[PDB]
């Protein structure tokens, strides 16, 4: 006879479990990597600040010097 | 009331520095630096008198 049967060892493996691997870094890490961005960040705004107001100030004593003739 | 005084249009003729404003703005330094003492005497007498028609000179 002929049917549609398992073999004699059956088939393999089939999952039915719930699989979340759980990836990711712990809260210290994001928290840290957080901070120092904030720190560079602020670091560099601190140094092109300063340098736009010397570059306004030179702007503003070239007004100065301009200003009788007109 | 009394009548404006005016200066006549031969009193305000003089030779006008007819550049640009960039020109100005690109030796605006030294022009402050070396003629300084004009500038200065003709702002402190603008200050002072507080009339346009008595600083013309």
Redesign the interface.
């Known amino acids: 006879v002929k049917q549609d049967m398992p073999p004699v060892g059956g088939y393999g493996p089939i999952d039915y479990k719930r699989n979340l691997p759980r990836r990711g870094l712990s809260g210290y890490s994001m928290f840290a990597v957080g901070i120092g961005a904030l720190l560079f960040g602020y670091w560099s705004m601190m140094r092109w600040n300063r340098e736009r107001r010397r570059l306004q100030i030179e702007d503003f004593?070239?007004?100065?010097?301009?200003?009788?003739?007109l | 009331p009394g009548i404006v005084e005016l200066p006549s249009l031969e009193d305000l003729k003089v030779q006008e520095v007819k550049v640009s404003s960039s020109v100005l703005k690109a030796a605006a330094h030294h022009y402050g630096a070396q003629c300084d003492k004009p500038n200065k005497e003709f702002m402190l007498c603008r200050w002072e008198e507080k009339d346009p028609r008595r600083c013309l000179e």
């Open positions: 004593e070239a007004r100065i010097a301009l200003m009788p003739l």
